[PDB]
Design a protein around this ligand. Structure first.
Ligand SMILES: C[C@H](c1ccccc1)n1cc(-c2ncnc(N)c2C#N)cn1
Length: 294
């Protein structure tokens, strides 16, 4: 008999994720079916999105050789039936207060910072770059969390040193770039560009650095279709472009310029679920039909 979710203490909520205390040394990391676009959590959930993204994360943890916070199998008996397939039992860590971001391509706030200053997070870049320019080598572009409705603020390496220590900052930088490089190469081999990615790390009792969040999901990372990669224009979101196009199209009745957006057409939600499955199966070489669920 699996426990009820109500047996555990809710300790944190994100836009589309939840965190629960299981015991003194373990948490339950829960992905929901909610989806965010234009910094709004949309009214309409995407069926199986939580399960698909959990499957993705589990695959990438297995691909990487670095210590991670997984503390049991996807069907661990401590996982409630209600969240089976979209929840992971993890080890409690002392989390480091740094959003560890790697960018292989220049877009979003990285692009904006570059267009404003010529630099991103302390990195002075060549002149002449633009939207979706390839960065080589990938950049460590750390950020810190701000207030509830605010975007993370980009910071430089010295800021990271000030947050975690000089040696630890080096370690975060090196591991972030190494992990991103490995996963990006794997994905691209399968036809998907991982343009960038965001990690959080924590520290265990012995002082070891442990990867601890979700890793390389389309929420934590920009997924692009490599077959349509065209530098100089904004790349379609592999998973969210249908959602984006409808919301800003002639059928939504919504002006993006910060009214809460309307619910999505069922057809758009279903199409979106399909894109998540496509991305998962291509990258993992596995079938989502095999992934556990209620
Ligand atoms: C910000 C992020 C979060 C995730 C899910 C929902 C809301 C927030 N978070 C992660 C921890 C955390 N703390 C201790 N040990 C861990 N292994 C983890 C993890 N993962 C605390 N917060």
């Amino acid at each position: 008999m699996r426990p009820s979710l109500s047996d555990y203490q809710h300790v944190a909520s994100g836009k589309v994720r939840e965190l629960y205390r299981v015991d003194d040394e373990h948490l339950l990391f829960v992905a929901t079916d909610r989806i965010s676009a234009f910094d709004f959590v949309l009214d309409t959930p995407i069926p199986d999105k939580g399960r698909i993204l959990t499957a993705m994360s589990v695959f990438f943890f297995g691909l990487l050789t670095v210590p991670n916070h997984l503390a049991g199998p996807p069907d661990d008996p401590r996982i409630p039936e209600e969240v089976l397939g979209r929840a992971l039992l993890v080890r409690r860590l002392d989390m480091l207060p740094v959003e560890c971001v790697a960018r292989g391509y220049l877009t979003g706030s990285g692009l904006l910072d570059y267009q404003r200053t010529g630099a991103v997070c302390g990195h002075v870049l060549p002149q002449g770059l633009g939207e979706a320019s390839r960065l080589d080598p990938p950049l460590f572009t750390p950020a810190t969390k701000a207030d509830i409705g605010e975007h993370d603020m980009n910071v430089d390496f010295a800021a990271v040193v000030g947050l975690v220590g000089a040696v630890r900052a080096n370690q975060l930088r090196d591991e972030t770039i190494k992990i991103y490089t490995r996963a990006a190469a794997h994905a691209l081999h399968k036809g998907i560009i991982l343009a960038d990615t965001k990690f959080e790390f924590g520290v265990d009792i012995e002082g070891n650095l442990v990867l601890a969040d979700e890793v390389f999901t389309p929420d934590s990372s920009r997924y692009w279709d490599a077959a349509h990669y065209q530098p100089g224009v904004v790349q379609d979101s592999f998973d969210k472009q249908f959602v984006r196009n409808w919301l800003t199209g002639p059928e939504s009745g919504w002006d993006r310029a910060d009214t809460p957006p309307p619910p999505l057409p069922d057809e758009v939600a279903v199409a979106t679920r399909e894109r998540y499955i496509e991305a998962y199966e291509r990258i993992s070489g596995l079938s989502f039909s095999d992934w556990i669920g209620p």
